[PDB]
Amino acid sequence: APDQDEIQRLPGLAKQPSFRQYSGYLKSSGSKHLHYWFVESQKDPENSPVVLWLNGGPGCSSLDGLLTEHGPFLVQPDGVTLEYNPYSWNLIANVLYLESPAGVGFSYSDDKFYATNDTEVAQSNFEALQDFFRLFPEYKNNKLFLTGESYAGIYIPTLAVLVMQDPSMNLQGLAVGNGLSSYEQNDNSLVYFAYYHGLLGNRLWSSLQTHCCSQNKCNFYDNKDLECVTNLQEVARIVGNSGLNIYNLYAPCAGGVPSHFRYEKDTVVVQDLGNIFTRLPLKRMWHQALLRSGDKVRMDPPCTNTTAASTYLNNPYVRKALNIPEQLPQWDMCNFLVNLQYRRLYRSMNSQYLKLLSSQKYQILLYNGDVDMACNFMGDEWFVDSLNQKMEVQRRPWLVKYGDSGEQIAGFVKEFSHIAFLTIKGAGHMVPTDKPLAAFTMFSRFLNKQPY
Amino acid sequence: APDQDEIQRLPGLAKQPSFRQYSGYLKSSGSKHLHYWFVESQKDPENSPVVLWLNGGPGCSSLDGLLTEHGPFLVQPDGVTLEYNPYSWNLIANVLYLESPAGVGFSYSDDKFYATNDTEVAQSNFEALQDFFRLFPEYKNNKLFLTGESYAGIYIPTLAVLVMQDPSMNLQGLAVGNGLSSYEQNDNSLVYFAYYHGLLGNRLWSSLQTHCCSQNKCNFYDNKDLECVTNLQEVARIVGNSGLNIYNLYAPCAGGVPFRYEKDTVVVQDLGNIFTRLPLKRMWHQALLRSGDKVRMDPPCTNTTAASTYLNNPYVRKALNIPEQLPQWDMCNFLVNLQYRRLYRSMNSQYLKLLSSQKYQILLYNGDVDMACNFMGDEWFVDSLNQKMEVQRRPWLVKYGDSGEQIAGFVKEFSHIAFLTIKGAGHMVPTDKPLAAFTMFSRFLNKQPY
Ligand SMILES: *[C@@H]1O[C@H](CO)[C@@H](O[C@@H]2O[C@H](CO)[C@@H](O)[C@H](O)[C@H]2NC(C)=O)[C@H](O)[C@H]1NC(C)=O
Ligand SMILES: *[C@@H]1O[C@H](CO)[C@@H](O[C@H]2O[C@H](CO)[C@@H](O)[C@H](O)[C@H]2NC(C)=O)[C@H](O)[C@H]1NC(C)=O
Ligand SMILES: *[C@@H]1O[C@H](CO)[C@@H](O)[C@H](O)[C@H]1NC(C)=O
Numbered sequence A: 001a002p003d004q005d006e007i008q009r010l011p012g013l014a015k016q017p018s019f020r021q022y023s024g025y026l027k028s029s030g031s032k033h034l035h036y037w038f039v040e041s042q043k044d045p046e047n048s049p050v051v052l053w054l055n056g057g058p059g060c061s062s063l064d065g066l067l068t069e070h071g072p073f074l075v076q077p078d079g080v081t082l083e084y085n086p087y088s089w090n091l092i093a094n095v096l097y098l099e100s101p102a103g104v105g106f107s108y109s110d111d112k113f114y115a116t117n118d119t120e121v122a123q124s125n126f127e128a129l130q131d132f133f134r135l136f137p138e139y140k141n142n143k144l145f146l147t148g149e150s151y152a153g154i155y156i157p158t159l160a161v162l163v164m165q166d167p168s169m170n171l172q173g174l175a176v177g178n179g180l181s182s183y184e185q186n187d188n189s190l191v192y193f194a195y196y197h198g199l200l201g202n203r204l205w206s207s208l209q210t211h212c213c214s215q216n217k218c219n220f221y222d223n224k225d226l227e228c229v230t231n232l233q234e235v236a237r238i239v240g241n242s243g244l245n246i247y248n249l250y251a252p253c254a255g256g257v258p259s260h261f262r263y264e265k266d267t268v269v270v271q272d273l274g275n276i277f278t279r280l281p282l283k284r285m286w287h288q289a290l291l292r293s294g295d296k297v298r299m300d301p302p303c304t305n306t307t308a309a310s311t312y313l314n315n316p317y318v319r320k321a322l323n324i325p326e327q328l329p330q331w332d333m334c335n336f337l338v339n340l341q342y343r344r345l346y347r348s349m350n351s352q353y354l355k356l357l358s359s360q361k362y363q364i365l366l367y368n369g370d371v372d373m374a375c376n377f378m379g380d381e382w383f384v385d386s387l388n389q390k391m392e393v394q395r396r397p398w399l400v401k402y403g404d405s406g407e408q409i410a411g412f413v414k415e416f417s418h419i420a421f422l423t424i425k426g427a428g429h430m431v432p433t434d435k436p437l438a439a440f441t442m443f444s445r446f447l448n449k450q451p452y
Numbered sequence B: 001a002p003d004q005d006e007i008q009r010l011p012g013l014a015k016q017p018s019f020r021q022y023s024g025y026l027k028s029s030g031s032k033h034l035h036y037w038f039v040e041s042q043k044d045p046e047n048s049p050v051v052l053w054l055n056g057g058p059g060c061s062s063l064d065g066l067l068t069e070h071g072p073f074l075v076q077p078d079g080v081t082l083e084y085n086p087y088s089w090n091l092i093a094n095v096l097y098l099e100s101p102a103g104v105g106f107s108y109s110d111d112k113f114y115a116t117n118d119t120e121v122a123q124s125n126f127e128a129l130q131d132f133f134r135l136f137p138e139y140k141n142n143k144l145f146l147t148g149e150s151y152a153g154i155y156i157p158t159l160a161v162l163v164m165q166d167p168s169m170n171l172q173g174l175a176v177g178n179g180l181s182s183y184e185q186n187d188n189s190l191v192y193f194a195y196y197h198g199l200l201g202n203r204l205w206s207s208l209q210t211h212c213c214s215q216n217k218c219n220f221y222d223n224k225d226l227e228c229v230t231n232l233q234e235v236a237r238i239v240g241n242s243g244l245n246i247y248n249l250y251a252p253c254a255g256g257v258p259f260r261y262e263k264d265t266v267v268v269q270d271l272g273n274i275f276t277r278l279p280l281k282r283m284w285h286q287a288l289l290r291s292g293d294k295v296r297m298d299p300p301c302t303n304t305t306a307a308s309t310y311l312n313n314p315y316v317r318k319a320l321n322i323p324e325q326l327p328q329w330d331m332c333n334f335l336v337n338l339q340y341r342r343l344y345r346s347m348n349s350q351y352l353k354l355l356s357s358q359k360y361q362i363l364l365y366n367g368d369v370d371m372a373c374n375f376m377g378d379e380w381f382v383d384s385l386n387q388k389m390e391v392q393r394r395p396w397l398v399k400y401g402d403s404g405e406q407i408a409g410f411v412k413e414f415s416h417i418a419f420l421t422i423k424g425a426g427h428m429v430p431t432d433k434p435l436a437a438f439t440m441f442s443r444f445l446n447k448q449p450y
């Protein structure tokens, strides 16, 4: 391990961690430097799996996964205090949170050119993962698992395909939460999700079925039909521009609008990460004129208050503690420019998953919180079914014993050989944030190869 | 008002109420005495509307609505303490909670014959309302509103049709929460609900679509295809017999996932209202009773201990003016639900009758995560009445202290009838979203846009 990267006295903690945790940079392609924050297992880190965690966006920080989802401690509303987390994934694994690609968070590159794409990001993360192993040679033999969320549903399988070609890396499996596996299956399932979760009504639903469907087949993905598009445009407005929380239908929207943007003092805050209805000829805000206007612009995840986390990370002492070059600009959970200039290239993760499944060496899990609308569970359940694999287990519910309010159904699980699809009932996009104990129980049975 | 009925000092409250409240019996057809518990409006009861509240079952107590939903105070887990409810419906109305029919809660009949049906129940309630007005003549000119939930989706509109005919009663409107307005519409929308909420899977969904549907319609109600029926029986099992809470999909089931036994008491939780057109299936048939064991019926995945423990307190009974000879209070009466005869299959005629006068304000409101009387079944039901659209479907709002203004659900308005959803609430809307429910109720009473 690089002694110079270790975190000695992390602010906001009243009692110091009982496990070692590091913060530094992993070098990647070109002039890239990816900020990592590694937290060792709280029990037997020496023999605990190395678990990579990636958040999505594209252009959003994995320190979101640490500080707000499943890190050993979570930032508090004061943006000053950190409280230990009883459901930390690092209780049983050495977790590496990587801010990728360059420009996201405290990550950067010498030329500061942040326009990128799917292929380059997977190679950058791959090269960074190589660097990690040269900085932590002691973990070269530890079972490695690649995990992530949302857009990492793209990041993870593309990175996994590179890793499988490296015999030095002990790739054992991968898990993706509410991941964007297929834009088509996601966009289509969402329109259905919306009607049946009561957002549309029969009139809208009726026109949609009339203008976008023929047979029991609906095309809510790349339909050009005039009135169909006029209807999908409203569906788009209702789902994400009306004040509803696209990450959790049943939760309030932090700083709720009735629009496609909002102002925060004098900063335009954009919250559309560009992954939904991309193929529809919809009318959208001119995100492209935003940089020319000269107004301050920031991208925040939808219905998410980034204050606590941003307030914590931007504290000089925290930056000092985390070994952050003073020259680096302020931390934001998502980088607007990175997202805006990002180039999506793959249409779906089918080939990657097929390639990983062919080896029959990897443990794969796709898990979705069932009240999320950004990457709804249906689109991902369809995805997994379309892989046409051998079924190992007929759909069934999975349980979690809660602080003795007895075992309760935590969701449903479909198992095939080497791949399982699973739902977390009552959870939104950020499953660990909504259902901490169940997310952990699911994480634990995955690592341990125990049935869910 | 019946002075002798006044609740003078109710046990459990650390501070006495600011409003007068009464507990007694309303006489109805035959040997029947229905226990009522009237709580006056906390503000200007003299001019406040009289609001009847009925729960369902059939065979369950309206005190459930009081003590656990929107009463002025609610029972705490200790089944001893009552805490005031800042979202109480009695903040703006003189609410009348009535235990019905006979045999439910503290209600009874001199002959103890509790087998009944829809027609007898509405007549019974009607005569009870007549008696309430005999006891509280001062409340005769006050606007009357009939509200209820669940099976009261049948109780309420059928009672309103009787009430509509009595000019001495000042009926102004009715409101039904997660009401069973139509067995067919409830069953068909529930299967869709099940799939789109992630309980089914496409392998089961395909089988359903293949055997129960024909030409972009499905019949998940009274379908005669044998494999379709085999699939529907599976859907019924997952929804109401797998560990999921049918009243709120995203909520745990009280007691967890395994027939609660309570030592000489088999607890059954099958009220009998979903998939009624599938082959006969009664959960109690599975009960193996010892000679001397009693069967108690409770709402599915609910714990009735706090309310029952409180209500069976000898002191509580006394302050509530309950005849000492009456049996123990239970939130539901198994025998009443067991002998109950459902006569109406749909409430279309009743609502059309009430809508024809264009004199009553009608509201059907559903919590969208409930699977017993899901919001879609009732949205469909209200759409099927084919009334004039006043308000095109839109979200309605609630200003939260912590959250600021948030979308509380969606509302679609027609002339004299509005359908409204409560986002994130289950079957028992006020229990789930107290502030939204009170907000809705207040806009309803005051004829204000939702
Ligand atoms: C529903 O309940 C009412 C009341 O018991 C039933 O009507 C009674 O039927 C009995 C037997 O036919 C008669 O002796 C009574 O005179 C009737 N009472 C009244 C007020 O009409 C009714 O038949 C029951 N069942 C149905 C299907 O309606
Ligand atoms: C993905 O992004 C990378 C970098 O932004 C692109 O890389 C290529 O860029 C130029 C055009 O080929 C060349 O001058 C670079 O040498 C080349 N770099 C590499 C590593 O190939 C790449 O073309 C992008 N891919 C797509 C499909 O747009
Ligand atoms: C966001 O977080 C900060 C600190 O946690 C808090 O002060 C603020 O009120 C929160 N909500 C909004 C809308 O800013």
Ligand SMILES: *[C@@H]1O[C@H](CO)[C@@H](O)[C@H](O)[C@H]1NC(C)=O
Pocket (backbone or CB within 6 Å): B076, B077, B078, B079, B254, B255, B303, B304, B305, B306
């Ligand atoms: C039911 O509630 C009571 C009191 O509220 C509690 O003591 C009891 O343990 C609960 N039982 C179950 C099965 O939830």
